Amino acid sequence: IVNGEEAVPGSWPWQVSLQDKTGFHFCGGSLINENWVVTAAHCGVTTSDVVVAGEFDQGSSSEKIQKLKIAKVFKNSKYNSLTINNDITLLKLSTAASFSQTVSAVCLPSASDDFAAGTTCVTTGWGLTRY
Amino acid sequence: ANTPDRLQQASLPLLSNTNCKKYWGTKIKDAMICAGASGVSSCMGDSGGPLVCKKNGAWTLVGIVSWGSSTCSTSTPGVYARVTALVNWVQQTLAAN
């Protein structure tokens, strides 16, 4: 995020980090329950990647984080890689997340819910702060 | 480029798809929602994470960080997967697995 600010630690408890086998953060995701994470299809997650829950500072070794294996990647088969449309994948975890103060689920909307242009929302992540 | 160690946040507004098309043209599909162009931007490495809106006291996943300006320009809208268009598939997948 460019021109954002640091979050209160633990205050976005659904936010996960997707890390590759080398430990590199490459994408975010959101817990929707103890067994499932929603992410983008174009992130190209595989069962060799790891879901990291409960993290704030990726340079700290003192946070009680959960490194969760991925059992299966469910890419939405409406995903169109040419247009990047329907850009959603579900990750089924091999072992459940343990919910806590710092690890819990985001709500999902109904298909008929209205989120009007002009509404102020929030986005979070460990993406670049400067290109 | 700068990658942060610490989790970042930003508040930003939703756009209409019609207005977002003034920036991105026919790249904008019904299963996308734009947000930003407001002095902040999602950027590389944010992809897959949440765009949440607070409704009746609870944060709800409205978008998934998807794509946008190749320079993360804060005057251009970011593009997010529109969760309302995708949630039936989420529920079907959970139910079947």
Binding site: - | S66, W67, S69, S70
Partner: peptide
């Protein structure tokens, strides 16, 4: 444009 670029994936994010």
């Amino acid at each position: 444009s670029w994936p994010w």
